[PDB]
Amino acid sequence: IVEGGPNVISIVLEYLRDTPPVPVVVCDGSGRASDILAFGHKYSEEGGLINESLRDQLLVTIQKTFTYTRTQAQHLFIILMECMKKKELITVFRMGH
């Protein structure tokens, strides 16, 4: 997954809980939702345990980068926590060889 709109978060959830569950590698650098998946995966503890400072920080970057409503930004943070929880299937291609 690269770049990717609001839809790719639910697509990551649909592929995270797949039959059987299958990995979702996300290449960062491009931006948009792949970068909030990456900025989760870097430092989100036990996946869905994004802490409170990140809560406000992630919700600022969602409500600013996606330009969506604040309720939708909180809701995509909850779907993000659902997807982030299974981060062992998530891999990030941090470019920079």
């Binding site: 920080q57 600022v60 970057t61 600013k64």
Partner: peptide, 26 residues
């Protein structure tokens, strides 16, 4: 210069994040 540019890129990333958060606060 390559390793010290890795300093400047990481440090300024915190500068861009703090400026964006201060814009939300004000």
């Amino acid at each position: 210069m390559s390793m010290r540019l890795e300093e400047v890129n990481e440090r300024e990333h915190s500068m861009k994040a703090s400026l964006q958060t201060v814009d939300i606060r004000l």
